[PDB]
DNA sequence: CGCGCGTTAGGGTTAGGGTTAG
DNA sequence: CTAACGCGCG
C-alpha cells in the first residue's frame, strides 16, 4: 500500500515537504522554548556527508524524536525543508512522525516513537543496517560518556548515572545527588541547603557513602530535574568539572564541583532512560558490582 | 440514529547547535 | 501520524 520516499539529504530542496533518513551528529534534548511547545534541535548526516540542522516542535514531550546519544539513527516521515538565513533549515510540519534506532552494530533494530501505529518494512531495516555500518566506518565513538572513575577537573562531559535525590536550593538552582557504581579520583562537593528538601532514601543515599556525587542544575534545566523520578535512570549531557579548595564546612580539601550551566549549547539537559536501554544494562551491572564497606 | 471505513488535510511562533558563571 | 471529514452502509 504506503511506499514513503525518503530523499538524500544532498538532494533537500526548499520548499517541499520530505521523508528523510540519517545519523545524529548533534541534538539538544527537548526543553520548553520560549513558545508554547517543547524543542528539540538534531543534526543529522548521511552517506553524502551532506548535514541537515532540523528544528521539532511539540506540545507532547515524548512526540519530538527519542534521541539518546550522538551515532543514534533516525527517521523523520512529513519535515518541512525551508531556507533560514540563507541556509538550508527541517522543521516540524503536520502530522510529523519520528523513528529513532541504537546506532550500534549487530544490535537489535527497535523502533523508539510515541506513535500509536508506523509504517516499517524491510527496506527501512536494511536501511537502518547501512548507516549504522556508514556511521561505523565514517563517525567516531563518543569520548564525552565517561564514567566518574575516569573524570578530570575542567571538563565536560556526559553522564550515564542512576538518580538516588533531589532538593530545592535557591529556586534558580537544583540539586541532584546521582551515581554511577565507579568513584570519582577526587571526593565529590556537598552543596549545603538551610532546610533539606531531600526527595530520597536517606539510608540508601548515606551507605553509599562517596560513590554519590552531588550536581547543581541552574535555570532551564532545573524545572526538568523537579520532574525526575528517584530511581530512574539519566543521561545529564555537557555536565561541567571543576575542581574546588575548601568544603562547604570551610575545611582544606580538594573537591570535585559538577555544573549543569543554563541554556541548550553542546546539548546541556536532562534524558531518562528506559531500562530497555543496553547503556543502562551496564549500568546496572556497574551498580550491583559496587565496591562498598 | 449510529457506526464505520476510506480519504487525506493539515493555526504556524517557539528557535534556528557551538559551554560566563553560579 | 492522526483525527477531522464525508459518503455509504446497517
New binding site residues.
Partial sequence: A?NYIYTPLNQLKGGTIVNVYGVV??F?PPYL?????Y?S?V?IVDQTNVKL?C?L?SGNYEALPIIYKNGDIVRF??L?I?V??K?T?G?????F?SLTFEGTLGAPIIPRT??????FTTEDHKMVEALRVWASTHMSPSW?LLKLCDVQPMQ?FDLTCQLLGKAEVDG??FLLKVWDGTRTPFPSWRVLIQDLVLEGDLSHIHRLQNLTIDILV??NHVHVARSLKVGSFLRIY?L?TKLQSMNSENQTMLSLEF?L????????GIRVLPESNSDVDQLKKDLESANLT
Avoid at 91 to 95: E, K, L, V
Avoid at 261 to 268: A, D, E, L, Q, V
Wanted: net charge positive; hydrophobic share 15%.
Fill in positions: 504506503t551528529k548533534f539538544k522554548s520560549k513558545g508554547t511547545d524543542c534541535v543534526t540542522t528544528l516542535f516521515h512529513r518541512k525551508q533560514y538565513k541556509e533549515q522543521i516540524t510540519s503536520s502530522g512522525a510515541s506513535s500509536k501505529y508506523f509504517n564525552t565536560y534558580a538552582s541552574y535555570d555537557s561541567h555544573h550551566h543554563g541554556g541548550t549549547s553542546y546539548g546541556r
